[PDB]
Design a binder for this molecule. Structure first.
Ligand SMILES: [Ca+2]
Length: 187
């Protein structure tokens, strides 16, 4: 068991936020009589919302407003990446601890409840903890000190996650899939 402590990222790592957003974006396009495929919309949103709108909905009246309403509805039932809860469990079964660092406010906590993974986290750091944003290592150094982390892995989907982890003296994993993370961990 290579690491004891796991410092997670939510969006793009545990939470498939682009899936719920894609569902909302595709359904909003349909209101205007427009069909676009899942994979194109998903990739466009991963670039940015302005890119997705300029690409697929540049002159659709009230599109953003309606899209955001549909997205909020989708997020009544957020979607984790496939296999997340089983991986969290396998790690916890070996005595591992899970932490979460987010730049978002305390809505994070609602998402963890709705997806039934709140029980996994020893501590969830949100913006209300007052720390600087990644890639600044402040929040991960706080966790390292408070929880006396000697064997920690920082998992996130973006460069800033890796940079924060490195600057905090922790090993990192650039998340692409749950299966691949399992392969790296032998678990
Ligand atoms: Ca992320």
């Amino acid at each position: 068991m290579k690491y004891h402590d796991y410092i997670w990222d939510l969006g793009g790592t545990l939470l498939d936020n682009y899936e719920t957003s894609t569902a909302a974006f595709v359904e909003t396009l349909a209101l205007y009589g427009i069909t676009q495929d899942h994979d194109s919309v998903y990739q466009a949103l991963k670039v940015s919302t302005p890119f997705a709108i300029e690409t697929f909905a540049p002159n659709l009246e009230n599109f953003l407003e309606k899209y955001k309403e549909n997205e909020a509805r989708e997020l009544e039932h957020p979607i984790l990446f496939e296999g997340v809860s089983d991986l969290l469990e396998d790690i916890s079964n070996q005595g591992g601890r899970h932490f979460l660092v987010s730049h978002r406010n305390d809505q994070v906590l609602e998402i963890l409840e709705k997806t039934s993974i709140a029980a996994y986290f020893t501590e969830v750091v949100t913006s209300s903890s007052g720390f600087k944003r990644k890639p600044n290592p402040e929040s991960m150094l706080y966790l390292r000190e408070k929880y006396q982390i000697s064997s920690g892995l920082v998992i996130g989907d973006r460069p800033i996650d890796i940079e924060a982890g490195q600057a905090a003296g922790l090993d990192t994993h650039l998340f692409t899939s749950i299966v691949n993370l399992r392969q790296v961990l032998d678990i």
